[PDB]
DNA sequence: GTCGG
DNA sequence: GCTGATGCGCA
DNA sequence: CCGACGGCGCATCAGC
């Protein structure tokens, strides 16, 4: 990988600011730099060169200078050698333990995995499930399994009502060889911006996936978003597949393109597209693209008939999902 | 941390 | 209950 | 040279 050194460096630092320093802005700042640099088609040979790129500033350039000179960064070596920092960072890897909780747990001497398993009682349900499948959630999902999981989900959706449409989004939709989790966008005719008089559209689908033992646990669940756990069925005498995170998001059918755009990501792409829409005087969310009022407030949703249409409004060359990755 | 008001 | 803030998610 | 930075769903707690 071309500038992997640098981008691993910046990505490790971002994680440090988010998880340990709880500096969310520095987090984004490192993330922005890392994306632009990873996109940069020449091997970077100095800090000054990188500083031309948007979102690289003086300090990231010093850091690139150091790393190019020595193959490491001292700041990161300090961080790597601080048990406290390192235990904080590590707890955030549990699903449902973010920066606050991680920090609190460490402040009362919960520093290891063994410690968490001995204090289940201190964990809410989400954290308790995060911990239970901690090792499973660390693994990636090969595309060939994602294809099995998709087949399973679309099959059951169809079974509940053939008018549902389910679309596997995220990295999968971008053509990744492996995904972190499974992201499913859901639409039904009876759910539109103009209204829902029909009850339990998401519920019916979650219930049916539990009925067939695909969904095994629920992290959080509302009327439009489900966050939970699933598992492919294994064969006799072969060890089980790991459990996997699954997110299902019910979007109004008439807002499908904004939704699919949102759920396809990547998260950096989304944030840069939304940032760009603003420079052009629009605001994009998963539901709509709207123009900006001078008073700050957003006006009315513009009509969209394709993903392509959203890019057009902000005057971007359409980018296929595979080119929305990092 | 960066870029821009 | 509510509104709002915060925490932890998602892309 | 301080001070915004995409946007939002769900869970939970504070102060009504
Ligand atoms: Cl749309
Ligand atoms: Cl909206
Ligand atoms: Mg992700
Ligand atoms: Mg995903
Ligand atoms: Mg996901
Ligand atoms: Na720059
Ligand atoms: Na976490």
Domain spans in chain A, listed from the N-terminal domain onward: 1-82, 83-139, 140-262, 263-325
Is A140-262 CATH 3.40.50.300?
no
Contact A61, A50 (CB under 8 A): yes
In DSSP notation, A138-166 reads HS-EEHHHHHHHHHHHHHHHHHH-TT-EE
Residues with CB under 7 A from strand C: A 92, 94-102, 130, 169-171, 180-181, 183, 227, 245, 247, 262-267, 270-271
Q: How far apart are CA A28 and CA A32, in angstroms?
A: 6
Domains A83-139 and A263-325 share a fold: no
Contact A245, A180 (CB under 8 A): yes
Question: How many angstroms is C1' of D10 away from CA of A227?
Answer: 9
Contact A157, A246 (CB under 8 A): no
At the top level of CATH, the class of A83-139 is mainly alpha
Count how many residues are written for chain A.
326
Kindly report the number of other CB atoms within 10 A of residue A232's CB atom: 16
Identify the DSSP state of A254.
G
Q: Which residues of A are catalytic?
A: 63
Record the tokens describing residue A113, joined without a space.
Answer: 């995995």
Annotated binding site of A for Mg(2+), which residues? 181, 183, 247
Annotated binding site of A for dGTP, which residues? 140, 171, 174, 180-181, 183
Record the tokens describing residue A112, joined without a space.
Answer: 């290891």
Record the tokens describing residue A210, joined without a space.
Answer: 């539990």
Rounded to the nearest 10 degrees, how much is the dihedral formed by the CA atoms of A263, A303, A272, A95? -20
Distances in Å between the Cα of A91 and the Cα atoms of A18, A134, A319 are 13, 10, 36
**Coil, helix or strand for A250?**
strand
Residue A245: strand pairing partners: A229
Give helix then strand counts, H and E, for chain A. 16, 9
Q: How far apart are CA A142 and CA A20, in angstroms?
A: 31
Distance (angstroms) between ligand 2 centre and the Cα of A56 equals: 32
Distance (angstroms) between ligand 6 centre and the Cα of A33 equals: 9
Distance (angstroms) between ligand 1 centre and the Cα of A188 equals: 14
Name, in order, each residue with C-beta under 8 angstroms of A189's C-beta and a sequence gap of 6 or more: A163, A253
Name, in order, each residue with C-beta under 8 angstroms of A251's C-beta and a sequence gap of 6 or more: A185, A186, A187, A224, A258, A259, A260, A286, A287
Q: How far apart are CA A248 and CA A257, in angstroms?
A: 16
Which CATH number applies to A1-82: 1.10.150.110, 3.40.190.10, 3.30.565.10, 3.50.50.60? 1.10.150.110
What's domain A263-325's superfamily in CATH? DNA polymerase, thumb domain (3.30.210.10)
Distances in Å between the Cα of A260 and the Cα atoms of A43, A54, A168, A170, A251 are 34, 28, 9, 9, 9
- Residue at token pair 């629009």: A282
Q: List, in sequence order, every beta strand (DSSP E) within chain A.
A: 141-142, 165-168, 178-179, 182-187, 215-221, 225-230, 244-250, 282-284, 289-291
């Amino acid at each position: 990988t071309l500038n992997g050194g640098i981008t691993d460096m910046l990505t490790e630092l971002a994680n440090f600011e988010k998880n340990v320093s709880q500096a969310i802005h520095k987090y984004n700042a490192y993330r922005k730099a890392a994306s632009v640099i990873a996109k940069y088609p020449h091997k970077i040979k100095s800090g000054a060169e990188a500083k031309k790129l948007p979102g690289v500033g003086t300090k990231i350039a010093e850091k690139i200078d150091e790393f190019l000179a020595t193959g490491k960064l001292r700041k990161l070596e300090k961080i790597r050698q601080d048990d406290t920092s390192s235990s904080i960072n590590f707890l955030t890897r549990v699903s449902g333990i973010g920066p606050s909780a991680a920090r609190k747990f460490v402040d009362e001497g919960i520093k290891t995995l063994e410690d968490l398993r001995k204090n289940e009682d201190k964990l809410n349900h989400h954290q308790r499930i995060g911990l239970k499948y901690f090792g499973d959630f660390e693994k990636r999902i090969p595309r060939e399994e994602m294809l099995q999981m998709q087949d399973i989900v679309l099959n059951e959706v169809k079974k509940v009502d053939s008018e549902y449409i389910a679309t596997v989004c995220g990295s999968f939709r971008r053509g990744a060889e492996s995904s972190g989790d499974m992201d499913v966008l859901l639409t039904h005719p009876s759910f539109t911006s103009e209204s829902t008089k029909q009850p339990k559209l998401l519920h019916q689908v979650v219930e049916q996936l539990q009925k067939v033992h695909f969904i095994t646990d629920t992290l959080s669940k509302g009327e439009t978003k489900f966050m939970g756990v699933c598992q492919l069925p294994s064969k006799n005498d072969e060890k089980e597949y790991p459990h996997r995170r699954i997110d299902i998001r019910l979007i109004p059918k008439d807002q499908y393109y904004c939704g699919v755009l949102y759920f396809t990501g990547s998260d950096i792409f989304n944030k840069n597209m939304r940032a760009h829409a603003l420079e052009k005087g629009f605001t994009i969310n998963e539901y709509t693209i709207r123009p900006l009022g001078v008073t700050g407030v957003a006006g009315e949703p513009l009509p969209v008939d394709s993903e392509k249409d959203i890019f057009d409004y902000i005057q971007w060359k359409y980018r296929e999902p595979k080119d929305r990755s990092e």
